[PDB]
Ligand binder design. Structure first.
Ligand code: CDL
Ligand code: PC1
Ligand code: LMT
Ligand code: LMT
Ligand code: LMT
Ligand code: I49
Lengths: 63, 51, 171, 60, 459, 170, 97
C-alpha cells in the first residue's frame, strides 16, 4: 500500500510540477489579453476571441 | 528498430485519421463565406476564409 | 443439556447479579444477598425431584418479574460497552507470511523464532491427525471434546489456533 | 495473396460501375417522369412560419 | 471522427503483431493515448453541435459518453489480464480484439447522425458482448445469460427497425440534424401508440426499465469482469442515449404515453433498492443497484425538462464510473476467494487497509454524497420531478434513504466486523488493483471541480 | 473593473470614528499590522507582475453576431434558413438567461447591502426582478427539453391569440 | 474421466515479492506498471485536467455574460425594457382568423 501511494504521488508530480510551474511563468511573463474594440476593417482570427494565453493556444492549435 | 516498430501504428492511425477528417471538410465547402451570419469580403491576400 | 443442579446454580448467580443491580450500595447488597441465599438453603435438601422442579420453575417466573430492566454488565462481557472493542486490532498470524522481505528484516529475531514454531507445527501435524483417528469411535465423535497428548514429545491435537490466537490487547 | 487482392479489386471495380450506372438511370427516369407529368408534381406555394399555425404543447 | 476510428482499429494489428509477452503493455499504453486525444471533442459550441461530416457528429450529449467509452478500454484491459493469465496466447488476443471491436462500435454508435446507422451499430454491440460473456464467462449459466441478453434486446430492437424505416419513408430522412427541423407533432391514434412503443421499448430494455430488468442480474453474475465493466459503464447508456435522441420526434404523445413507464420507474427504483438489502451475491447486488439508478434516468428522460436532461446526462456518466468501480472492487475479492457471496469474507478492512478506502469512496459516490457528480445528477432529477408533481419527493426521498442503507450495508458486511477465520489467502493488494481503483475514482471526483462538461446539451 | 451602470452601487457613507473610551482600539492597531505585513508585500508582488504584463500587451475581442432572419421569415421545411434562424434564437436564449442572472445579482447584492432595512430599500431591484422574470417566463418557460425557435413561436402565437380574444371580449 | 485435475491457484508474490500484479515476468511486470502510471496519471489525468480547465469558453458561457451586460447597459441607457415578453416581432406574424 505504501509503495502504490508513493508511485501514485511520483507520477502525478512528474508532469504536475512542470505544469504548475509552466502555468505560473505564463501568467507572470505573458499575462492575459486586454479587452479591446474590434478595429474598423479588421477581422480577428477565431483564437483572438479568448483572453487566457493557454485558452488561445488551445483554440489556435486544435480547435 | 524491429523491436519497437509496432509503437507507430496507433500514432500513424491518428495522423491518417486526422488527415482524412480534414480532406472530408474540403467536400463540404458549399457555404464557405456564404452564410448570412459569417459572410464577408475577402482579406487583401486571403484566398479562402477557412479550410 | 443442563442438569437440574446446573440450572439451579445458574439462577442463583443470575438472581444475585440482578439483586446487585437494584441495591447498588454494597452494605445493602450484602444484606439482601444473604436473605436470597437463605431462600436457596431453605430447599437445598428437597429430595422429591418433582417438587424440586416446581420450585425451580416458580423461582424462574419470580426472577422474570423482578429482574432489573437494565442490569449491570461487565464492560467486556457480551452486550457490554467494551465488548468486541479490540477485534479491529486483532490480526491473524498468517498475515506475516505476506510481509515484504524488507519488513521482515526489521525483526530478524522475531521471525527466526517464528520459523521454529512453523517447523514445530509441520512436524506435529501427522501425529495429531493419527491420534484423533485412532481415538474416535466408528460413527465419528459424539462430543466436541479433544484429547490431550499421550506420549512425551507429542502436542495435543489441534493446538495451533488456540496457542497462537491474537492477544486480548494486541496493539 | 496478391491475386486475392487483385481479383477482388478487378471484379469490385466493374460492380461499382454498374452500381453507379443503375442509380444514374434511376434518377434519369425519375426526372423525366416528373417533367412529363407536371400536373402530378405541382410546385406548391410555401408559407413562412410566421404565417403557418402550429399548436403549442407545453411541457410542464 | 476518423481520427478516433482509425487509431482504434489500429489497436488490432498492434495486439496481433506485438511480442508474445507485450500484448497487455502495448494495448493498454496505446488505448490510453487514444483516450487522451478524445478530449479534443470538448470543442463544443453554445448553439451548434460539432458536425464533422455527413456520417458523424458530436454534441454535448455524445462527447462525455465518448470519453467514458474510450477511457474504459484501458481500464478493462488492466482488469482482465490477471484472470486470463493461463489462457493461450491466441485466445488472449481474440479477447482483446473483442474489446477493441466493442469500442469501435460504441464510438460510432454515439456519433452517428443517421438513425439507421445508429441502429446497426447499436445492434452490432450485441455480438462482441455476447461472445465475451459466453466464451470467457466462468460458470455453466453463462450460456443462458447470453441467450436472455440476446433475445431481450432483439425482442425490442426488431420493432424499432420497423418504426425507423417507417419514419424515414414518411419524413424522408433519419438524419438527426434534419429531424430537428422537419419534426412534426405525433397525433393521437392507435397507429401512433404502437409507433411510440416501437421507438422506445428497445431502449427501455437496455436501460433497463423495471419489469424488463431480470436479464441484467443474470448477465452480470455470469460475465467476466471486463464484460461487467462495459455492460454497466456504457452498454446500459445506449438505451439512455437512444431515448434522449428519439424523444425529439415523439411529442406531444409522450405527455401521456410516459405515465406507465414513470410509474414503473418511480416504483421500480424503490423495489430494486429494497431488493439490494437482501441480496446474497455481491455482483447481483451491484446489478440491482444499477437498475435503481437507471430508473431515475428513465424518469428524467420521459418528463423532458432542461433540468432533467442535465440530470440524466450527469447520472449516466457518474453511474458508469461508480458501478464499474464497484464491479472491480467485487472482482478483486473474487480473485482471492473465488466466490461472489457477500457474507463469505468479512472484516477485510483489517487485512486490506487501502483497498477498504476504495470501498468507502465507491460507496459514498453510490449513495450520492454532495458534491459528487452522482449527487449533482440525482439532485437535478429530483428538482425537476418535483415540478412535474410535488408528491414524487416522497418516493425520491425514500429511495435516497434505502440507497444509503444498502450502500453502507455492503461496505459494513465485507469490510468491517471480524475477519473470517478460515480464509487465509488474502494477499496484499497489487499495484495493478490499486491503480485500477484509482483510475475510476480520481476522474470521477475531479469532475466535481468542473461539472459543466458532463451536463449535456441543455447546459 | 466592471461597468458601474450594469452593476450599480450607491455612494458609500462611512461614519468617522467617534471614540468615547480611553482604551486603544485593538482593531486599529491590527489594521496597521495587516497593512504593513500583509497588504504592502502583496502589493509589491502585484506591481512586479503588472510591469511584466505591460512589456507584452495584446488584445482579445468580444464577438459580434450579425442579425439574420428569424424563424418567422423562414419558409416551412427550408432547413438552410431555419438553421441560421434557429442558431440565432439559441444565442439569444443564452443571453436572456444571463440578463436574468444580472438582475438577480442586483437583487441579492441590494438585500445584503441594505441590512435590516432591505425590505423598504430594495423595492426597485425587486420590481425590476419581477418584470424580467415575467418576460423571461413568457418567452421560454414550458417549452421542454427539445425546445426550438418553432416551439417558442407556437407559444407566442398562442399567447397573442388569447390576448386578442380577451381584448375582443373587452 | 480422462480429465486434468484443477490446478492450484498461484500467488504472484511467492516467486516475485516485488510483483506489481501485472505479469509473472519481473521485467514485463515493471514496464506494464510504468505505462499505466505514466500514460494514465502523468498524461491523461494531469494534462487532461489542465486541458479541461483552460477550454476556450466552453459553449460560449462567458460570451453570453459579456453580451448580456452590453444589452443591459444599452437598454437601460435608452429607457427600453430589459427584456420583452415577445421573442418575435409581432409585425412579422400573422395570426389566423
Ligand atoms: C487539481 C485540478 C488541476 C486543474 C489544472 C489547474 C488549472 C489552474 O491552475 O487554474 C487555477 C488557478 C489559475 O487560474 P488562471 O486562469 O491561470 O489565472 C489567470 C489570472 O489572470 C492570473 O493572474 P495573476 O497574474 O495574478 O496570477 C499569477 C500569480 C500566480 O498564479 C499562478 O500561477 C497559480 C498557479 C497554480 C498552479 C496550479 C494550481 O502570481 C503570483 O505569484 C501570486 C502570488 C501571491 C502571493 C505573494 O489557480 C488557482 O486557482 C490556485 C488557487 C488560487 C488561490 C486560492 C486562494 C485560496 C482560496 C480561497 C477560497 C476558498 C476558501 C477556503 C475554503 C476552505 C474549505 C472550507
Ligand atoms: C481547487 C483546484 C483548482 C481548480 O479548481 O482547478 C481549476 C479547474 C476548475 O476551476 P475553473 O473552472 O474556474 O478553471 C480555472 C482556470 N481558469 C481560470 C482559466 C478558468 O479545475 C478543472 O477544471 C479540473 C477539470 C477536471 C475534469 C477532467 C478530468 C480528467 C478527465 C480524464 C478523462 C478520463 C476520465 C473519464 C471521463 C468521463 C467522461 C467525462
Ligand atoms: C503549463 C504548460 C501548459 C502548456 C500548454 C500551453 C502552451 C502555450 C503557452 C502560451 C504560449 C503563448 O501564448 C500566446 O502568447 C501571445 C502573447 O505573448 C499571444 O499572441 C498575441 O500577442 C503577441 C505578442 O506576444 C502577438 O504576436 C500578437 O499580438 C498576438 O498573436 C497568443 O494569443 C497567445 O496564445
Ligand atoms: C487533450 C490534449 C489532446 C492532445 C492531441 C494530440 C494530437 C495533436 C494534434 C495536433 C494537430 C495540430 O495541427 C495543426 O497545428 C497548427 C499549429 O501547430 C495549427 O496552426 C493553424 O491554427 C489556426 C487554424 O485556423 C490558424 O491560426 C493557422 O491556420 C495556423 O496557425 C493548425 O490549425 C492545426 O491544424
Ligand atoms: C500481395 C500483398 C501482400 C501484403 C502483405 C503485407 C504484410 C506481409 C508480411 C510478410 C512477412 C510476415 O512474416 C511473419 O510475421 C510474423 C509477425 O510479423 C512473425 O511471427 C511473429 O510470431 C509472434 C506473433 O504471432 C511474435 O513472436 C512476433 O510477432 C513474430 O515472431 C514471423 O516470424 C514472420 O515470418
Ligand atoms: N417492383 C419494385 N417495387 N421495385 C423496383 N424494381 N422498382 C423500380 C424502381 C427502381 C428502383 C431502383 C432503381 I437503381 C431503378 Cl433503375 C428503378
Amino acid at each position: 500500500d505504501k509503495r502504490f501511494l508513493k508511485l501514485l504521488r511520483f507520477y502525478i508530480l512528474l508532469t504536475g510540477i512542470p505544469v504548475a510551474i509552466g502555468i505560473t511563468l505564463i501568467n507572470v511573463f505573458i499575462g492575459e489579453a486586454e479587452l479591446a474594440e474590434i478595429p474598423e476593417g479588421y477581422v480577428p482570427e477565431h483564437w483572438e476571441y479568448f483572453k487566457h494565453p493557454i485558452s488561445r493556444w488551445i483554440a489556435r492549435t486544435f480547435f | 528498430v524491429r523491436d519497437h516498430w509496432v509503437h507507430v501504428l496507433v500514432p500513424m492511425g491518428f495522423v491518417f485519421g486526422y488527415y482524412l477528417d480534414r480532406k472530408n471538410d474540403e467536400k463540404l465547402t458549399a457555404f464557405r463565406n456564404k452564410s448570412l451570419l459569417y459572410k464577408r469580403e475577402l482579406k487583401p491576400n486571403e484566398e479562402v476564409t477557412w479550410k | 443439556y443442563l442438569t437440574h443442579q446446573q440450572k439451579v446454580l445458574r439462577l442463583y448467580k443470575r438472581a444475585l447479579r440482578h439483586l446487585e443491580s437494584w441495591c447498588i450500595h454494597r452494605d445493602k447488597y450484602r444484606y439482601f444477598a444473604c436473605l436470597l441465599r437463605a431462600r436457596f438453603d431453605e430447599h437445598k435438601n428437597e429430595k422429591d425431584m418433582v417438587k424440586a422442579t416446581q420450585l425451580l420453575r416458580e423461582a424462574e417466573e419470580e426472577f422474570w418479574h423482578g429482574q432489573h430492566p437494565q442490569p449491570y454488565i461487565f464492560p467486556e462481557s457480551p452486550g457490554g460497552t467494551s465488548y468486541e472493542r479490540y477485534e479491529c486490532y486483532k490480526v491473524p498470524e498468517w498475515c506475516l507470511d505476506d510481509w515484504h522481505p524488507s519488513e521482515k528484516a526489521m525483526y530478524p529475531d522475531y521471525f527466526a523464532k517464528r520459523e521454529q514454531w512453523k517447523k514445530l507445527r509441520r512436524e506435529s501435524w501427522e501425529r495429531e491427525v493419527k491420534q484423533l483417528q485412532e481415538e474416535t469411535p466408528v460413527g465419528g465423535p459424539r462430543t466436541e471434546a479433544l484429547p490431550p497428548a499421550r506420549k512425551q514429545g507429542d502436542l495435543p491435537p489441534l493446538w495451533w489456533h488456540i496457542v497462537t490466537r491474537p492477544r486480548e490487547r494486541p496493539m | 495473396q496478391l491475386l486475392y487482392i487483385t481479383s477482388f479489386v478487378f471484379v469490385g471495380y466493374y460492380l461499382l460501375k454498374r452500381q453507379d450506372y443503375m442509380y444514374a438511370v434511376r434518377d434519369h427516369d425519375m426526372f423525366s417522369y416528373i417533367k412529363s407529368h407536371p400536373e402530378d408534381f405541382p410546385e406548391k406555394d410555401k408559407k413562412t412560419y410566421g404565417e403557418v399555425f402550429e399548436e403549442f404543447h407545453p411541457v410542464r | 471522427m476518423l481520427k478516433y476510428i482509425i487509431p482504434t482499429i489500429m489497436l488490432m494489428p498492434l495486439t496481433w503483431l506485438s511480442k508474445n509477452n507485450m500484448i497487455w503493455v502495448n494495448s493498454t499504453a496505446h488505448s490510453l493515448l487514444i483516450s487522451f486525444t478524445s478530449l479534443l471533442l470538448m470543442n463544443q459550441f453554445g448553439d451548434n453541435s460539432l458536425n464533422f461530416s455527413l456520417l458523424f457528429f458530436s454534441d454535448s450529449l455524445s462527447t462525455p459518453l465518448l470519453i467514458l467509452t474510450m477511457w474504459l478500454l484501458p481500464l478493462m484491459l488492466m482488469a482482465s489480464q490477471h484472470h486470463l493469465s493461463k489462457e493461450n496466447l491466441t485466445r488472449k488476443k481474440l479477447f482483446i480484439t473483442m474489446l477493441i471491436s466493442l469500442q469501435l462500435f460504441l464510438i460510432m454508435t454515439f456519433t452517428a447522425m443517421e438513425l439507421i446507422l445508429f441502429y446497426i451499430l447499436f445492434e452490432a454491440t450485441l455480438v462482441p458482448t455476447l461472445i465475451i460473456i459466453t466464451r470467457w464467462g466462468n460458470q455453466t449459466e453463462r450460456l443462458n445469460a447470453g441467450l436472455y441478453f440476446l433475445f431481450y434486446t432483439l425482442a425490442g430492437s426488431l420493432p424499432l427497425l420497423v418504426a425507423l424505416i417507417y419514419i424515414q419513408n414518411t419524413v424522408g430522412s433519419l438524419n438527426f440534424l434534419m429531424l430537428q427541423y422537419w419534426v412534426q407533432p405525433v397525433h393521437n391514434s392507435w397507429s401512433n401508440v404502437f409507433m411510440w412503443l416501437a421507438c422506445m421499448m428497445a431502449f427501455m430494455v437496455k436501460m433497463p426499465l423495471y419489469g424488463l430488468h431480470l436479464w441484467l442480474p443474470k448477465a452480470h453474475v455470469e460475465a467476466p469482469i471486463a464484460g461487467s465493466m462495459v455492460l454497466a459503464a456504457v452498454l446500459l447508456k445506449l438505451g439512455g442515449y437512444g431515448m434522449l435522441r428519439i424523444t425529439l420526434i415523439l411529442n406531444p404523445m409522450t405527455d401521456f404515453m410516459a405515465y406507465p413507464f414513470i410509474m414503473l420507474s418511480l416504483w421500480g427504483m424503490i423495489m430494486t433498492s429494497s431488493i439490494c438489502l437482501r441480496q446474497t451475491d455481491l455482483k447481483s447486488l451491484i446489478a440491482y443497484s444499477s437498475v435503481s439508478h437507471m430508473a431515475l434516468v428513465i424518469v428524467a428522460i420521459l418528463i423532458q425538462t432542461p433540468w432533467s436532461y442535465m440530470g440524466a446526462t450527469a447520472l449516466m456518466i457518474a453511474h458508469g464510473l461508480t458501478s464499474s468501480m464497484l464491479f472491480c472492487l467485487a472482482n478483486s475479492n473474487y480473485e482471492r476467494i473465488h466466490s461472489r457471496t457477500m457474507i463469505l469474507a468479512r472484516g477485510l478492512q483489517t487485512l486490506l487497509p487501502l483497498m477498504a478506502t476504495w470501498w468507502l469512496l465507491a460507496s459514498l459516490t453510490n449513495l450520492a454524497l454532495p458534491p459528487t457528480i452522482n449527487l449533482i445528477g440525482e439532485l437535478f432529477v429530483v428538482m425537476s420531478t418535483f415540478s412535474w408533481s410535488n408528491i414524487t419527493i416522497i418516493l425520491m426521498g425514500v429511495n435516497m434513504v434505502i440507497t444509503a442503507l444498502y450502500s453502507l450495508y455492503m461496505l459494513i458486511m465485507t469490510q468491517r466486523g471480524k475477519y473470517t477465520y478460515h480464509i487465509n489467502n488474502i494477499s496484499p493488494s497489487f499495484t495493478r488493483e490499486n491503480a485500477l481503483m484509482s483510475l475510476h475514482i480520481l476522474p470521477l471526483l475531479l469532475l466535481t471541480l468542473n461539472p459543466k462538461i458532463i451536463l449535456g446539451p441543455l447546459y | 473593473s466592471w461597468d458601474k451602470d450594469v452593476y450599480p452601487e450607491p455612494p458609500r457613507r462611512t461614519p468617522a470614528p467617534s471614540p468615547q473610551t480611553s482604551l486603544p482600539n485593538p482593531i486599529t492597531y491590527l489594521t496597521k499590522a495587516f497593512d504593513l505585513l500583509v497588504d504592502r508585500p502583496v502589493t509589491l508582488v502585484r506591481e512586479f507582475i503588472e510591469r511584466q504584463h505591460a512589456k507584452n500587451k495584446y488584445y482579445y475581442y468580444h464577438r459580434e453576431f450579425r442579425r439574420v432572419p428569424d424563424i418567422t421569415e423562414c419558409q416551412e421545411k427550408d432547413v438552410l434558413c431555419m438553421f441560421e434562424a434557429e442558431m440565432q434564437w439559441r444565442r439569444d436564449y443564452k443571453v436572456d438567461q444571463e440578463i436574468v442572472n444580472i438582475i438577480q445579482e442586483r437583487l441579492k447584492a441590494c438585500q445584503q447591502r441594505e441590512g435590516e432595512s432591505h425590505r423598504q430599500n430594495c423595492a426597485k431591484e425587486l420590481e425590476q426582478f419581477t418584470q424580467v422574470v415575467k418576460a423571461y417566463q413568457d418567452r421560454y418557460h414550458d417549452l421542454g427539453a427539445h425546445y426550438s425557435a418553432r416551439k417558442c413561436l407556437a407559444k407566442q402565437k398562442q399567447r397573442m391569440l388569447a390576448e386578442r380574444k380577451a381584448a375582443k371580449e373587452a | 474421466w480422462q480429465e486434468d485435475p484443477e490446478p492450484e491457484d498461484e500467488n504472484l508474490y511467492e516467486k516475485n515479492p516485488d510483483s506489481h500484479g501485472y505479469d509473472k515476468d519481473p521485467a514485463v511486470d515493471i514496464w506494464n506498471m510504468r505505462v499505466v502510471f505514466f500514460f494514465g496519471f502523468s498524461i491523461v489525468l494531469v494534462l487532461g485536467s489542465t486541458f479541461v480547465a483552460y477550454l476556450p469558453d466552453y459553449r460560449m458561457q462567458e460570451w453570453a455574460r459579456r453580451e448580456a451586460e452590453r444589452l443591459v447597459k444599452y437598454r437601460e441607457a435608452h429607457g427600453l425594457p430589459i427584456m420583452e415578453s415577445n421573442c418575435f416581432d409581432p409585425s412579422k406574424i400573422q395570426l389566423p382568423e
